[PDB]
Design a protein around this ligand. Sequence first.
Ligand SMILES: O=P(O)(O)OC[C@H]1O[C@@H](O)[C@H](O)[C@@H](O)[C@@H]1O
Ligand code: ALF
Ligand SMILES: [Mg+2]
Ligand SMILES: [Mg+2]
Ligand code: NA
Length: 218
Amino acid sequence: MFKAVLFDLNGVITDTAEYHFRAWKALAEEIGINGVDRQFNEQLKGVSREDSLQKILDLADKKVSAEEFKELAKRKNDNYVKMIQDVSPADVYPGILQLLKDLRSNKIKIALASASKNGPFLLERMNLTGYFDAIADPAEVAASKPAPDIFIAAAHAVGVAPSESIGLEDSQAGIQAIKDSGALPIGVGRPEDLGDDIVIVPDTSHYTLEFLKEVWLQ
Ligand SMILES: O=P(O)(O)OC[C@H]1O[C@@H](O)[C@H](O)[C@@H](O)[C@@H]1O
Ligand code: ALF
Ligand SMILES: [Mg+2]
Ligand SMILES: [Mg+2]
Ligand code: NA
């Protein structure tokens, strides 16, 4: 049976993918780039802060100075950090708290495989930190999503092979990262966005321990 579950945070544990989208869209429009809509944002989910900005600049073939690049990423993060101050345990997505409880009861390791440097703060806001056996530090990996490194690091941090792990993701980049780590992906969202070749559930209430074991077995 699987021995760890490797969690993405934004769009899996809580609805903060929505806030990343709103903040990036606001930033893009400030610099005169209007193409950051929900469809384009599927290319931004899972991607690091700097890679997100670069993808936005690329969309418009725009070049900025190194100084302006750093300022823009900082501006977006400062705004996003303000947006999330009132996140609370009430914001935890359906099913997720009970999943964490059930995993712990069954001695299955729990690791965070998030790209977000705001991850630890968000787990604290939601009173979830105590459920996690490890948080992979995204500043320490040599390569970010869709590279598998963050999922490999998360598995290794809890003493489990990726091949004995399930990864939970809402993003195209993250699904690819899980695939290339050796872990089994289960996505949450639309197959139109995430593909028809892995198990995809429509909402996080489907993430029960009962449902994960069967995927591993099949
Ligand atoms: O800017 P942060 O908080 O470090 O987050 C990095 C990335 O974290 C990922 O989890 C999100 O899906 C991305 O949208 C985000 O860019
Ligand atoms: F949405 Al994440 F790492 F939390 F890609
Ligand atoms: Mg996500
Ligand atoms: Mg703890
Ligand atoms: Na708290």
